[PDB]
Amino acid sequence: EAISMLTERLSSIINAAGGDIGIAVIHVETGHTTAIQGTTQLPLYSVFKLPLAIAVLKEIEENRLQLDRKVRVTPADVAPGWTANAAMWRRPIDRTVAQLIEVSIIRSDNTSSDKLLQLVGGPAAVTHRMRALGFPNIEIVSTVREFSENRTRPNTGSAEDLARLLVQLQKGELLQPQHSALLLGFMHRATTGTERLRGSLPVGTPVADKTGTGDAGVVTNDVGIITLPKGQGHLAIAVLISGSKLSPAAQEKLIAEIARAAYDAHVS
Ligand SMILES: *C(=O)[C@@H](NC(=O)/C(=N\OC(C)(C)C(=O)O)c1csc(N)n1)[C@@H]1N=C(C(=O)O)C(=C)CS1
């Protein structure tokens, strides 16, 4: 029956991909869950910026921080190898906490993410916030710089915990309404995953997403929320691909095809 056999189809889409692949698809309103290796913790790379943004917004909601607090960013905060977004960080600049979350989510900025990581108390504090919220299978152990000088101790998370996190975000149970609207607005405008969760959906499908990419196709990740048409609800979806044999383009196409299969199963 269409959602019953989604696991069969997902398993054949990723067959012979090699590596380690975790998938979780959760229908937000009903809770219907489809998972493949859904409890295995896999390298997150830039996907960790989504738990980071939640921990930052929890700090504001727990009255230890403000959205409009000015934070000074200097070229000293940019790691050497960070080439993608470094153009905004060449002379000292003041950004509000809201603006730091913005650029870290939309542009997958490493510099602003590491600044936010310090504001909340480092990797251990984010890991604690995750279990305090109900997601004990998300372990943040490294800053972005630390991990960049040696890929050995990566931040990991299971696909099911990321999807469950997105379910509560979409439902309005995770953050205050204005913080939920603010974060989903950022994720709707994210520009790093045009070929992934959005790649194969029908024209006009709203998608909020956060990607993760390692160099040379070592890791290709995408987690997000797909708005179904009609009044059919939302899909929280996490795809974590680690160490695949496939080329980068084919790994992105794997994510796009997984999303379209989950979309098709849950739409009438
Ligand atoms: C999150 O996953 C970030 N990724 C990285 O910092 C790494 N590589 O980034 C790219 C741009 C793919 C590169 O070729 O250098 C990375 C860190 S440790 C490792 N083995 N690789 C951000 N992701 C992207 C993206 O395009 O998804 C960015 C635009 C900026 S860094």
118 CA to middle of ligand 1, Å? 20
Separation of alpha carbons 180 and 192, rounded Å: 21
214 CA to middle of ligand 1, Å? 5
Pocket of ligand 1 (CB under 6 A): 45-46, 84, 108, 110, 147-148, 151, 192, 211-215, 218
Task: Identify whether the C-beta of residue 239 lies closer than 8 Å to the C-beta of residue 14.
Answer: no
Burial grade of 144 (CB within 10 A; 0-12, 13-18, 19 or more)? buried
Query: For atom 13 of ligand 1, which residue has the closest CA?
Result: 215
**CA distances to 97, 117, 148, 169, 209 from 110, in Å:** 15, 10, 10, 23, 17
Separation of alpha carbons 52 and 47, rounded Å: 9
Query: For atom 3 of ligand 1, which residue has the closest CA?
Result: 46
- What is the domain partition of the chain in residue ranges? 1-268
162 CA to middle of ligand 1, Å? 19
Query: For atom 16 of ligand 1, which residue has the closest CA?
Result: 214
16 CA to middle of ligand 1, Å? 25
Separation of alpha carbons 170 and 175, rounded Å: 10
The 10 Å Cβ neighbour count of residue 85 is 17
